[PDB]
């Protein structure tokens, strides 16, 4: 079994990249705020419905002129675990499982997670905040294994009828209360806010909506417009609050969509909304879920690098100034010149700068037209994709971190973590 771990460790070595000296350590011991946008796809960015911008605040961030670096070619890599798969990957640079939920099935595995590394190396305290109860998606158990110090779950918010819609707390209340909790924290902290309102079936009380639905006739697509606007407004106000509380300028702030909100079931309506047929290649393009990052002392902009959620962990560690040579990670640092510009998807599809591989066919990204002559790097990339998924699965299925005596990681004792019931 130790041999199985050794094989994965050796496999992950070749891709390792050196940090960009422009970015290496620039955020050492600064607060890190990580903002999850439930079910958010970047087809919303710059989209108008009935003449109204769906997501005007995110549109401003996406211009690159508002201190955030926006990655328009940034993809989730989730499977059946959906939100929990995104969380898993964001904090571990590992894939979820091909079937089922890693959180639900592998919650008592040994991990060497991002929050634990930040805690150990730089004295961070890590928290998650979320307007649902802690045992949903097995978060209570998983987070203890990840070494997350605090979980402000629904018991930390007023869950009365007026404050909830669909699965739980409304995003506007959530962000307002969460900013207030964050202002009471000691630095350095690593805080992950997981939103909720922009979730299937995408329902919002009329009183809370500020944009009319689209008119495709598909209730999912049409409702998504309203919940996406609501989330955008909630986020805008959250950023305002951070500025008032002095938690904006000197924090690393990242924003990301977790996974797609609109499945292929909605191709008819999405063709109406977007004005083109949703082919398999087009659907793949629509799996862009976005990454925006603000780094203190650094200008924003637009970075066109093709990338996935696996890349976030090494990016954050390098920004902190932490040497990552001993961490078992599949991603590479977004800001490094050597960033591996190949994005595996959980189903074996993948994308690169020039082409996508979708259900056994290769398409040019320029026009989504079929490529008949196999690209020079295709075999290499296809192999990397297949092996990345297999190797990651081996870690989860073999619980392989049990066997890793890592010089740069102190084994987490999950019994040292407990999430007390909140005051509400
Ligand atoms: Mn989700």
Swiss-Prot record:
Protein's name according to its UniProt entry: Processed glycerol phosphate lipoteichoic acid synthase
Ranges for region Disordered: 406-424
Residue ranges that the UniProt entry lists as topological domain Extracellular: 1-424
Chain residues that bind substrate: 199
Active site, UniProt feature: 83
Gene source species: Staphylococcus aureus (strain MW2)
Ranges of compositional bias, category Basic and acidic residues: 406-421
Location(s) in or outside the cell: Secreted
Annotated positions binding Mn(2+): 38, 83, 258-259
């Amino acid at each position: 079994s130790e041999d199985d771990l050794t094989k994965v460790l050796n496999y992950t070595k070749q891709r390792q990249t050196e940090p960009n000296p422009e970015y290496y350590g620039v955020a050492k011991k600064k607060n890190i705020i990580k903002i999850h946008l439930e079910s958010f796809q970047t087809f919303l960015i710059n989209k108008k419905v009935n003449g109204k911008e769906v997501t005007p605040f995110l549109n401003k961030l996406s211009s690159g002129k508002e201190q955030f670096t926006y990655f328009p070619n940034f993809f989730h890599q989730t499977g059946q675990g959906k939100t929990s798969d995104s969380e898993f990957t964001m904090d571990n640079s590992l894939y979820g499982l091909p079937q089922g939920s890693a959180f639900s099935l592998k919650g008592d595995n040994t991990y060497q997670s991002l929050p634990a590394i930040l805690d150990q190396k730089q004295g961070y305290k890590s928290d998650v905040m979320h307007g649902d109860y802690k045992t949903f998606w097995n978060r209570d158990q998983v987070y203890k294994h990840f070494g997350i110090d605090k979980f402000y779950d629904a018991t930390y918010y007023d869950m009365s009828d007026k404050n909830v819609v669909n699965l739980g707390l409304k995003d506007k209340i959530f962000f307002k209360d969460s900013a207030n909790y964050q202002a009471k924290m000691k630095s350095p902290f690593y805080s992950h806010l997981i939103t909720l309102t922009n979730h299937y079936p995408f329902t919002l009380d009329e009183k809370d909506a500020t944009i009319e639905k689209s008119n495709t006739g598909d209730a999912t697509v049409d409702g998504y417009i309203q919940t996406a606007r609501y989330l955008d407004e909630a986020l805008e106000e959250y950023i305002n609050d951070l500025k008032k509380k002095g938690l904006y300028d000197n924090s690393v702030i990242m924003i990301y969509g977790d996974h797609y909100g609109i499945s292929e079931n909605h191709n008819n309506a999405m063709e109406k909304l977007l004005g083109e047929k949703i082919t398999p290649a087009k659907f793949t393009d629509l799996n862009r879920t976005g990454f925006w990052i603000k780094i203190p002392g650094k200008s924003g902009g637009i970075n066109n690098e093709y990338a996935g959620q696996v890349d976030v962990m090494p990016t954050i560690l390098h920004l902190a100034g932490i040497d990552t040579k001993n961490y078992l990670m599949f991603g590479t640092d977004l800001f490094s010149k050597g960033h591996n510009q190949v994005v595996p998807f959980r189903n074996g599809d993948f994308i690169t700068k020039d082409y996508k591989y979708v259900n056994g066919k290769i398409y040019s990204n320029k026009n989504n037209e079929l490529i008949t002559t196999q690209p020079a790097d295709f075999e290499k990339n296809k192999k990397q994709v297949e092996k990345d998924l297999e190797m990651s699965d081996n870690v989860l299925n073999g619980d392989l971190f049990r066997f890793y005596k890592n010089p740069d990681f102190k084994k987490v004792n999950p019994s040292k973590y407990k999430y007390e019931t909140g005051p509400k």
